[PDB]
């Protein structure tokens, strides 16, 4: 059985923790629930760690006292189709392969499924580790609880003796790097310096061998990514987000300084050897928009290239761990700001951005956001009980599964069918515009080989390539973003119309140029 | 009312039948249930047939004593979408037309539906008889029982006065030949010599006019295709399968000689005029894998061409009735073995195989097969009754309709939702790889006209054509095979990755060559 | 917010509770969850109760850490 | 077997930390956990039928007991 330790003794050296722990709603929660610090206490000095204490990162460390939130979190939504490739005609991006050609996502980009699987899914996706990691067998793909208990209880490593990224299956890529992990797990929260910068106290950084790093990681979406385990207060731990909101002074709501101030973030730094090591962001309120923005944002988490001169930006560069913290219409400017793009299109040669699930940045300025609605309101609402102690659902899922709590309490004028219809109206419309944007992107892309081969000049090709950047941006945001427009219908519509415009302009440029080459 | 005949009198001339009938569980079943042999008995000698007895091939000949299995067999699964074309974006092969161009399946290839309709569906599909046979009206498409009772109770013939294969509708083909029928019906089991070889005692052979042959045929999937009507013992009657397993010594489980020996096949031959005429394969066990392999395999049942010199292989050639009895990774070698391919791709000019529903060969070596699971376990399991005499379901259908009996008895760790999720994980993943393989096939195929027109050399074109064979093989197996990977997920994945690799290599070959032609 | 009390001090007079508490699965659960003993501790000796400490009998005292059992119970 | 087995059984979760239900109620509401895990030979309806056979029979004897008690009392 657990035996409590003397927290006062800890507090003599751990004044930051004391200040947090003694004041919050974990004041009575003994350190032994999450730390085995016996050898540590025997060996540490006021500034030297001595023996490293054991810190539990497993979610069951919170499940003993918070079973309801734990069981609700680990629930698997079987209706969320698993391993479902987005580049298929019945999914999000029917022409994805043509449009993303040149990028590692061509190897596999599946729809998201339940949070329990984020880490294992990160490990086994075809684009990530050369196929090195696989479920032990195809039965394990169902095991949400197992995945939560640890990725390595359900996965195998094709070659435990090597640690290099390489291809074990022919049609895989090795795009995983250590930055990715920060949106999958925070098991490494004590082993990773802020931003993944080199640091004498960090086991792991942006430049680590990601395969070795992966082997050290177990748990998806740790409960403490949103809840400080010492104060039990709301926080974020994602470096990239703290960096955008606080270091870069952009605010939690970059479009709204008042709301930014009311619902702010305070960066708290923890040191190793009296050097800054890691940081968390304590939230003024339990603001799920910002909690979810730890991961549901457009980011760099990868090497790239400079827009200016095309030189490699490696993992060693800060820009490999970056939250643009910009909506779709400020994105190009934000990418220019850091002088960065992701890949050159394999057919057009255009330098292109790669967009990632920008739900947070899409949600800004939308009607629900302006009305003070947050992600949790639609995606993890309070449970309604005829008789019971209320708690917040932690099953982050479509509102379709809980329409009464997620929509209809606020929308009393609607039945469930009407609320669903309103969603489908926006998604249907938006998806039609996505598909039309892809049609036009594909039409332009197919003209590039024709133009090159007809001898169209590099100047025209480059003009078309510059158009491709925008056509691509204003389309890809929306296949990347998971609400199919619902989070911001007007913005989706304007963006997708811009994409089609850009592609149409490029098509007409390329067609005329080809025709002039043929007539000459 | 039926009157029994003296079986002893039959047995005086029919010693093989006597040996089978007197020992099995049909020992008390009088010949009159299936034979009207009165004139026959008056006219036959010990070696000459005399007057041909009537033999009932209808399934109702078994339904009198086996109603439960009969009614379960004729059940129509309305949820199995009928006449649903596979070459559509919402079905199995969104780019099928481009990829199969040159082949008669371009005219129509629908998803399979319930067994009751196999014969009528064979007759009316657009690729088979030039549209000569149609349901009498569009209402008849529902009538499973009618179809079972006889194709000609529900179909019409556009021109009863001619017997040539020709087109009555513009966009049809005439690919049907007599070999096809062997996987639709065995009404002709006494009129067809083994393998469809010419034989003085055969009304029908590989070279018959298939329209005349078709008119003689009524019943789908006769009950006796798996059950010897004399011994009631398990058997196969499909010549092509007996030929692979026994004549060619490949075994019932070509990858497993031990299992092949334990679950073997004994070829029994029946003679006409003391010449070998027809054959059946008696099974050591009631092994549904091998029963279902009568039809659910990759086969030749058509004319083709030789890989070596491109000369026609006609219906007269044995190779027109062939079971390759090879998995996807041994297939090319098996096709080389008989020096055969199906069609030249209409755009690339590549010689290509045409793959048919290879469920049996896919299933080999899969985890379920290695554990001794068989088709019937998932697709026609025993019925569970609170109170009743157990019998085997004969409704051969997706396990989704009976998950408790088809999966969950064996998978006690799963709920139905979890079992379904595991299936969908594999199918989603596999289908994404199918779609990616088609993307790459299509990209390569589209380069062929560009390459030819840019003056790329025949040597390079032929190199690309050789790549096309493999790209095609390693893709088509999986749109042909009906489990969308479920029967063998690892093999689907490796094959589809091989297909994409092959296509990518061909694309790069063709692109470089085109570019060099343009630069010159 | 609950402030933990010094359980060891309670245990100086409460050896029978000490033997049960330090050993079971509530060894880390502070007395403050179920007792308000501030004035008790100011006035008691080992042989004189002093001010009667408050003991919580409400089921919510357990519900903060065992919500699932509590909610299942109250259905 | 103990009361809890039929009246307060462990909750079965596809994914989750198991705990003991504290809703003390008839097994009819949770036959899978309260009876069928032990009685794998039965469907829910069969288990319910076995309960009702006993309850119906016993209630008949309760009613007859009352009939006779009432007759004596009168
Ligand atoms: C003698 C002083 C001292 C004592 C007492 C002390 N610590 Fe530490 N501890 C340190 C120092 C120094 C570090 C390194 C970080 C820092 O410098 O603040 C550290 C680091 C840690 C870490 C981070 C370890 C990691 O992997 O990065 C944890 C967790 C921790 N302490 C917990 C505890 C607990 C729980 C107690 C009481 C059981 C305790 N400490 C008592 C000095 C102390
Ligand atoms: C409910 C779980 C839990 C409780 C209880 C808990 N900790 Fe922690 N602690 C964590 C986790 C998880 C981390 C990793 C850093 C983070 O999440 O911010 C951590 C990190 C730390 C660190 C490292 C801060 C740094 O320098 O990076 C110290 C020191 C620490 N804890 C001390 C304590 C002390 C002292 C107590 C007893 C008062 C305690 N913790 C109780 C979970 C817990
Ligand atoms: C030993 C019991 C215990 C442990 C273990 C535990 N908690 Fe708590 N937690 C509590 C108690 C007690 C409260 C306060 C209940 C109340 O008064 O509302 C609480 C409150 C919270 C709150 C409420 C914050 C608020 O202001 O409403 C959050 C969030 C929370 N815990 C998260 C966690 C996390 C995350 C973990 C794992 C890192 C964890 N807890 C582990 C006992 C525990
Ligand atoms: C800024 C946080 C963040 C970064 C960093 C991150 N992801 Fe993700 N990831 C997400 C979110 C949010 C989802 C679910 C939404 C979605 O997929 O659109 C997701 C989903 C996934 C999935 C499931 C869906 C799919 O695409 O197949 C995989 C696999 C994945 N990520 C792999 C990676 C890889 C590999 C990297 C590093 C190259 C990475 N992630 C980096 C936030 C992140
Ligand atoms: C993605 C961020 C996030 C993560 C990770 C997270 N929570 Fe929460 N949690 C929330 C939000 C949002 C609330 C509701 C805050 C509010 O509105 O008061 C909440 C509330 C809570 C509370 C307060 C009581 C309640 O239910 O409202 C507890 C306790 C809690 N969570 C425990 C956990 C546990 C245990 C885990 C790990 C299984 C976890 N949380 C992970 C976002 C998160
Ligand atoms: C339940 C139906 C049924 C029963 C009863 C039955 N038969 Fe048959 N018989 C068939 C069918 C169907 C065929 C076609 C060949 C086959 O299925 O193997 C056949 C074929 C034959 C043949 C042809 C074998 C050959 O040379 O090709 C003979 C002879 C024969 N039956 C004799 C008998 C005799 C004698 C009896 C009485 C003991 C009998 N059958 C009872 C159904 C039946
Ligand atoms: C006049 C009644 C009758 C006829 C007609 C009939 N059967 Fe049977 N069948 C039986 C009887 C009786 C048994 C043995 C029942 C038992 O003992 O299990 C049997 C057994 C079987 C078995 C069981 C084999 C085994 O070893 O379990 C199969 C398969 C079978 N019949 C198929 C057929 C087929 C196919 C037909 C039509 C070709 C047919 N029967 C027609 C009466 C009939
Ligand atoms: C008011 C009477 C009536 C209505 C209502 C009706 N039907 Fe019919 N339907 C007929 C008649 C009469 C025929 C032709 C019958 C015949 O000649 O055998 C027919 C023919 C058909 C056919 C064959 C068409 C063809 O081209 O051969 C189909 C399929 C069919 N009906 C389906 C339906 C469907 C489905 C509905 C409901 C959507 C429907 N019918 C409603 C009377 C009706
Ligand atoms: C080796 C046995 C076999 C051969 C011979 C055979 N089929 Fe099939 N057929 C099947 C099986 C098994 C299915 C159901 C599985 C599937 O369609 O993928 C099927 C399904 C069909 C269907 C329904 C699905 C569709 O494709 O529209 C048609 C029509 C059909 N076959 C026609 C033909 C034609 C025409 C021939 C001769 C050129 C032929 N079959 C030869 C085994 C066979
Ligand atoms: C595709 C091959 C196949 C066909 C065709 C077939 N069966 Fe069966 N049959 C089986 C299998 C497999 C079993 C179960 C054998 C076992 O496991 O004992 C079976 C079992 C039987 C039995 C034994 C009792 C039982 O239900 O388990 C009878 C009787 C029977 N079938 C009758 C029929 C009838 C009548 C037909 C025509 C309606 C038919 N069979 C067609 C495969 C077939
Ligand atoms: C007659 C017993 C039985 C049947 C019925 C059965 N399974 Fe299995 N299945 C097994 C066994 C044994 C394994 C391997 C177990 C192991 O090695 O861990 C397995 C493995 C699997 C796997 C992993 C396959 C792989 O390649 O790793 C999946 C997925 C699966 N089963 C799903 C199903 C589905 C879905 C059904 C119903 C359609 C089903 N099973 C029916 C016994 C069965
Ligand atoms: C989770 C609730 C809870 C916790 C924590 C708790 N108590 Fe109690 N305590 C009770 C309840 C309820 C009673 C009433 C008697 C009973 O339930 O046995 C009680 C009774 C007592 C009594 C009276 C025993 C008697 O003589 O009848 C003492 C002394 C006591 N507790 C001391 C403590 C001490 C000291 C602590 C801190 C280590 C503590 N308790 C922690 C709930 C709690
Ligand atoms: C501050 C949080 C907290 C409070 C308040 C709390 N408990 Fe617990 N309880 C725990 C923890 C932690 C465990 C140990 C979990 C584990 O390790 O299994 C536990 C364990 C238990 C167990 C399982 C004991 C065993 O031996 O299996 C029971 C029963 C229990 N508590 C009842 C209660 C009761 C009744 C109350 C109200 C009088 C209560 N708890 C209040 C945290 C709490
Ligand atoms: C009528 C007696 C009874 C009462 C009253 C009761 N429990 Fe339980 N409790 C049980 C039983 C029985 C178990 C299961 C013991 C076992 O098999 O391990 C249990 C188990 C537990 C456990 C251990 C974890 C688990 O769920 O198995 C906790 C914690 C718990 N109860 C909390 C509570 C809370 C909180 C209350 C007040 C709402 C409560 N109990 C009231 C009988 C009771
Ligand atoms: Ca999803
Ligand atoms: Ca990006
Ligand atoms: Ca079907
Ligand atoms: Ca074939
Ligand atoms: Na969802
Ligand atoms: Na089916």
UniProtKB/Swiss-Prot annotation, chains A, B:
Pfam families this protein is in? Cytochrom_C552
Q: Which residues bind Ca(2+)?
A: 298-299, 354, 356
What residues bind heme 3, as annotated? Answer: 26, 62, 65-66
Position of the 3'-(S-cysteinyl)-tyrosine (Tyr-Cys) cross-link:
299-301
Localization recorded for this chain is: Periplasm
Look up the EC number in the record and give it.
1.7.2.2
Q: How does activity depend on pH?
A: Optimum pH is 7-10 for nitrite reduction, and the optimum pH is 7 for sulfite reduction with only 20% residual activity at pH 7.8.
Regulation of activity is described as: Inhibited by azide and cyanide. Subject to competitive inhibition by sulfite.
Q: So, what pathway does this thing act in?
A: Nitrogen metabolism; nitrate reduction (assimilation)
Q: Which cofactor does it need?
A: Ca(2+); heme
Which GO terms fall under molecular function for this chain's record?
Answer: calcium ion binding; heme binding; nitrite reductase (cytochrome, ammonia-forming) activity
Under catalytic activity, the entry for this protein gives: 6 Fe(III)-[cytochrome c] + NH4(+) + 2 H2O = 6 Fe(II)-[cytochrome c] + nitrite + 8 H(+)
Which keywords belong to this entry?
A: Calcium, Electron transport, Heme, Iron, Metal-binding, Oxidoreductase, Periplasm, Signal, Thioether bond, Transport
Concerning PANTHER family, the annotation shows: CYTOCHROME C-552 (PTHR30633:SF0), CYTOCHROME C-552 RESPIRATORY NITRITE REDUCTASE (PTHR30633)
Q: How does it assemble?
A: Homohexamer. Dimer of trimers.
Give a short account of what the protein does. Answer: Catalyzes the reduction of nitrite to ammonia, consuming six electrons in the process. Has very low activity toward hydroxylamine. Has even lower activity toward sulfite. Sulfite reductase activity is maximal at neutral pH.
Family membership, please give it.
Answer: Belongs to the cytochrome c-552 family.
Name of the protein described by the UniProt record: Cytochrome c-552
Q: Please name the source species.
A: Thioalkalivibrio nitratireducens (strain DSM 14787 / UNIQEM 213 / ALEN2)
> What would be the name of the gene that encodes this protein?
nir
């Amino acid at each position: 059985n657990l035996k409590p330790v003397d927290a006062m003794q800890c507090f003599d050296c751990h004044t930051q923790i004391e200040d947090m722990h003694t004041v919050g709603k974990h004041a009575t929660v003994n350190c032994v629930h999450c730390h085995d610090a016996t050898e540590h206490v025997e060996t540490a000095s006021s500034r030297r760690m001595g023996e490293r204490p054991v810190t539990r990162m497993d979610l069951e460390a919170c499940a003993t006292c918070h079973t309801a939130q734990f069981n609700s979190f680990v629930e698997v939504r079987h209706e969320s189709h698993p391993r479902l490739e987005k580049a298929t005609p019945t999914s999000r991006s029917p022409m994805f392969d043509k449009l993303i050609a040149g990028h590692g996502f061509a190897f596999e980009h599946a729809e998201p499924r339940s949070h329990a699987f984020m880490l294992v899914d990160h490990f086994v996706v075809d684009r990530a580790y050369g196929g090195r990691f696989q479920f032990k067998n195809w039965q394990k793909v169902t095991d949400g609880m197992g995945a939560v208990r640890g990725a390595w209880t359900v996965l195998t490593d094709a070659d435990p003796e090597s640690s290099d990224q390489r291809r074990f299956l022919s049609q895989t890529a090795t795009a995983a790097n250590p930055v990715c992990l920060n949106c999958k797990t925070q098991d490494h929260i004590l082993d990773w310096a802020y931003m993944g910068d080199e640091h004498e106290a960090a086991k792991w950084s942006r430049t680590s061998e990601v395969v070795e790093f992966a082997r050290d990681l177990n748990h998806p979406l740790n409960c403490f990514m949103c809840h400080d385990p010492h104060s039990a207060g709301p926080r974020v731990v994602r470096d990239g987000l703290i960096n955008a909101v606080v270091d870069r002074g952009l605010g939690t709501y970059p479009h709204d300084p008042v709301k930014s101030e009311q619902q702010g973030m305070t960066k708290v730094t923890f040191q190793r050897g009296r050097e800054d090591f890691r940081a968390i962001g304590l939230l003024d309120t339990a603001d799920s928009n910002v909690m979810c923005a730890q991961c549901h944002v457009e980011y760099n988490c990868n090497p790239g290239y400079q827009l200016s001169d095309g030189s490699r930006v490696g993992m060693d560069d800060r820009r490999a761990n970056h939250f643009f913290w910009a909506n779709v219409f400020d994105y190009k400017e934000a990418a220019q700001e850091i002088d960065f793009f992701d890949f050159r299109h394999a057919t057009t040669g255009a330098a292109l951005p790669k967009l990632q699930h920008p739900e947070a940045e899409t949600f800004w300025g939308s009607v629900h956001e302006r009305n003070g609605v947050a992600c949790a309101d639609c995606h993890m609402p309070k449970v309604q009980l005829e008789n019971g102690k209320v708690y917040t659902s932690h099953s982050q899922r479509t509102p379709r599964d809980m329409m009464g709590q997620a929509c209809l309490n606020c929308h009393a004028e609607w039945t469930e069918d009407q609320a669903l219809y309103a969603i489908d109206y926006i998604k249907n419309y938006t998806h039609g515009k996505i598909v039309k944007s892809e049609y036009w992107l594909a039409k332009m892309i197919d003209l590039f080989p024709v133009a090159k081969r007809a001898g169209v000049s590099e100047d025209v090709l480059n003009q078309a390539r510059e158009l491709h950047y925008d056509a691509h941006l204003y389309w890809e945001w929306w296949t990347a973003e998971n609400s199919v427009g619902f989070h911001n219908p007007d913005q989706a519509r304007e963006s997708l119309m811009t994409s089609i415009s850009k592609s149409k302009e490029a098509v007409s440029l390329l067609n005329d140029a080809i025709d002039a080459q043929v007539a000459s």
